[PDB]
Design a protein around this ligand. Sequence first.
Ligand SMILES: C=CC[C@@H]1/C=C(\C)C[C@H](C)C[C@H](OC)[C@H]2O[C@@](O)(C(=O)C(=O)N3CCCC[C@H]3C(=O)O[C@H](/C(C)=C/[C@@H]3CC[C@@H](O)[C@H](OC)C3)[C@H](C)[C@@H](O)CC1=O)[C@H](C)C[C@@H]2OC
Ligand SMILES: CC(C)NC[C@H](O)COc1cccc2[nH]c3ccccc3c12
Lengths: 432, 107, 350
Amino acid sequence: WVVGMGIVMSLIVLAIVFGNVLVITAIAKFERLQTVTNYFITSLACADLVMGLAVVPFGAAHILMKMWTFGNFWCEFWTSIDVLCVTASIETLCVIAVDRYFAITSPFKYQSLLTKNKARVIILMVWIVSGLTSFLPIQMHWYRATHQEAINCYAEETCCDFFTNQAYAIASSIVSFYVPLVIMVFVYSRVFQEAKRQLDADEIKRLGKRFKKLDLDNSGSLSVEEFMSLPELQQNPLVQRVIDIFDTDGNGEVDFKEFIEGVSQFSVKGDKEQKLRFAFRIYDMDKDGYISNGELFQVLKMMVGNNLKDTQLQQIVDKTIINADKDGDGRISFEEFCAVVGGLDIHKKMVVDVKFCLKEHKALKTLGIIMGTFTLCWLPFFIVNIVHVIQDNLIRKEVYILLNWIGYVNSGFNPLIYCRSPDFRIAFQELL
Amino acid sequence: GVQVETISPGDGRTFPKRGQTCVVHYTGMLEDGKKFDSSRDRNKPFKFMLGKQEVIRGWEEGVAQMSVGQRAKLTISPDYAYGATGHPGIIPPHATLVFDVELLKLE
Amino acid sequence: TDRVVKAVPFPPSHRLTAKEVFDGKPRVDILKAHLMKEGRLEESVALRIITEGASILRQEKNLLDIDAPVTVCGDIHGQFFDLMKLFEVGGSPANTRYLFLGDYVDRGYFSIECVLYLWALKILYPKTLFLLRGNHECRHLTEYFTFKQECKIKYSERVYDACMDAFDCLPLAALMNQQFLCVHGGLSPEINTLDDIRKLDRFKEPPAYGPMCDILWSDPLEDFGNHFTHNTVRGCSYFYSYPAVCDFLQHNNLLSILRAHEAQDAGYRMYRKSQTTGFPSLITIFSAPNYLDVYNNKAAVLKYENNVMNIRQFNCSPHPYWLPNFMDVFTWSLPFVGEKVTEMLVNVLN
Ligand SMILES: C=CC[C@@H]1/C=C(\C)C[C@H](C)C[C@H](OC)[C@H]2O[C@@](O)(C(=O)C(=O)N3CCCC[C@H]3C(=O)O[C@H](/C(C)=C/[C@@H]3CC[C@@H](O)[C@H](OC)C3)[C@H](C)[C@@H](O)CC1=O)[C@H](C)C[C@@H]2OC
Ligand SMILES: CC(C)NC[C@H](O)COc1cccc2[nH]c3ccccc3c12
């Protein structure tokens, strides 16, 4: 009934707004997430929030009231805003796909040539192209039809039924959801056919042989006992901690999916930031991003043993933390750490012979899920629109509207997928 | 290189072993006598075990030449010292070390 | 968590913005109770205190005039808590007057605090306490030793520069009762009479050699019983022998000369008794108990009252802990983090 439909619409729009606000805030000030891909993601998030705020309540009101009495020129504004939101959600995904394609072929070249300036430039360029393609065709009245009903609705201030001209419908479909769709699919297919080859470089095969040799139970996992099976490693003080950085999902053991991803952190191809972040993550005993007094005291107490008095160690730790607090919280962040350390030249001391870098293979799965879900949800609307525009004219006057709401739910889905990433979780927990 | 110049000898019936842990009180210095650290600033002796590489090699190959309860002097060359890089904070690059270690207890 | 062991008091984290430490005459008791807890002061307040001390010390004569009932104390070398115990032992500065002789800065982790407290009490008490220049108030020695790092870690280098420009004006002769002369080091053959130490320019960095470079660096003979013989211990000044001090005391009517270099287990030493009068002619005073935490020396402080010379012994007192060269534990432990992590990973991979 009307109550249920209104409740569904209200819940949908509220969830869209809340999730997108969370996603935007997580990259606003808690800037541990400082990747160009994250700027593209936040562009997409503000785009779909604009889409929500603009069209979703208005479409719900139009459906419920069985009449759209807001106005007549607002009809053109509403349709053009919807078109802009869909087109700017397409081309941003295409840009992300091509970005990730060039960020795998040549990692150093991608990190050197491309910066935030080019990111903002291309984001603005695609937004302007979408804005032109959305505003101009509507305002020149090329959607005019020879149907008498279309003529009547054009000279009427209540209907605001989107009527499409055949040429305009074909042009819009081929320039907004058919060319960029095939381009993004092709480019990401090429990524998965060269990002599944780098894992066959005859080096990761050797590490796989090493992994098989090291494991005892042959269960595919590495536990603390199995790292301590080596007789020449049982006397390392901070051995548990390196396992704890390796152990990402908290399952209790290390598997080959995270073994070789963490070992690649200590590579010559890596930068200063990754090794310095590992040095930082040695101290965090909760991975929450901050070093307290207890954490920085117990980390040093497992190392210095009983060579200093407990009171002396506590006192030097207190003085260090007070000399490190640049804001007054009482804990050290990574920026305060890099103010304290950095210049000691510690990036040159954590060195291993490995020659494989896998620091960009971490975000392909979420981006792939985003692209797949988005295409799957928004394809049926365009295919049924194409079916309708042809002289076939099947009886689908109702589902043609339900697929639009399917597309709206799709546009809302994104923060649900982004919440799966472990690094986004703790940033969300900061606000909670 | 390492040089051991005994000031006060001790009992020669016992010598430290590779698997033994020595507990000593030491007052390090530098080439010009500028004291940099000590084990009497804090009231706690310093313990270390031979074999493993946690102390500089000069200590490892010099304390072995000592005896039990003997206070002596060491002049650790830059070769067996912290090397060209040098420990940040205290020891400058290419710094000859001078030590006044005194063995107290074994294990 | 928040604090693994709660027995150790937390150092206060807020500096004082001249609101409380000044009433202008400053407040001493709160400054003592604030710096005794490893507190801190704002840069402007510290610069103001040091500048006022320098201004009030510049007007002082090279040769001070001090009346009879006095208390004489030796060098300190940065031991703040031992200085507070010394003030407690010798009585309040209100009811007695002091004559500080030796250096105050090098070879200690609480030098800036000691100099701040001494000079604040100098500002409050301008006539009942007299400071004297030592051998460790130069640019060369302090740059060599651990005072520059003290200023850099605790404050800005501007504090260091102001403190040096303030040491530049210290007096160096400090006659007492016109019967005793108190110089930080010892006599020099270049100096003939008291007038020689009444006119020389004391507002400059000491030179390589000269009167002022020899007064603060001289040293009596260390093996008496075996005039200008050179120094092997320091390498910058001379000796003086019993005939030399006897001639100096005969030329200018005096009785004894006091000094504060030789760190001594007993704390005080009376040199060769003057056969003419019966009182010792050279006195050595040290007032820094447990010097360098290894000497285990009981300090000494002298009192002159009712025409009586007496010596009071002085014990130690606990102090907090600091790392050598003021390393923060990140710089302390990071080279032992990288080595161990890389060792474990190279061990696992191969
Ligand atoms: C918090 C954990 C860190 C861990 C801290 C402790 C165990 C507390 C312990 C009292 C150390 C002292 O801390 C007050 C302090 O002792 C010195 O003052 C010192 O007199 C010294 O030279 N000693 C100490 C006595 C043995 C010889 C030598 C040493 O070999 O010391 C070793 C040393 C420096 C190894 C280097 C590391 C750098 C590499 O490049 C080099 O490889 C060639 C090998 C000791 C065993 C390290 O475990 C020191 C640490 O870093 C160093 C001047 C600096 C050192 O603090 C850093
Ligand atoms: C009935 C209207 C208000 N609903 C439009 C849909 O939100 C999505 O429609 C589109 C999105 C993006 C580009 C588009 N080009 C078109 C051409 C004809 C009809 C719809 C679209 C269209």
